[PDB]
Each structure stands twice: as structure tokens, then as C-alpha cells.
Design a protein around this ligand. Sequence first.
Ligand SMILES: [Cl-]
Ligand SMILES: [Cl-]
Ligand SMILES: [Zn+2]
Ligand SMILES: [Zn+2]
Length: 56
Amino acid sequence: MTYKLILNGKTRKGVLTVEAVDAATAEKHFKQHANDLGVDGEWTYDDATKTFTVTE
Ligand SMILES: [Cl-]
Ligand SMILES: [Cl-]
Ligand SMILES: [Zn+2]
Ligand SMILES: [Zn+2]
């Protein structure tokens, strides 16, 4: 499925997407992104939209 990441960092904002066999495979992908972009935040997920948000 296609998942989405909303990055609500203080200094760095974005929306990323990735296709993954399951949410966890997708989420590990997106956490690596947030880590490499230096965005650390609280994580939440919305199932209906398949969209994670990282909030700094
Ligand atoms: Cl798919
Ligand atoms: Cl991506
Ligand atoms: Zn898929
Ligand atoms: Zn990616």
C-alpha cells in the first residue's frame, strides 16, 4: 500500500510517500527519513488515510 509521512518539524516541513508491503515496513522507512533529516518528534498515525505524522 502507499503510506504518507507528514513532517511537522520546527525547522523542516514536508510530505513524503512510500509503497510498502505493510505499515511497519513503511514506518521504518519513514523514521529513517525523519532521523536523517534531523526531525525528532512525537509520532502518531491515522489509519483511514495511511498517514503518519512526526510532530516536533
Ligand atoms: Cl500497493
Ligand atoms: Cl520516501
Ligand atoms: Zn503496496
Ligand atoms: Zn523514502
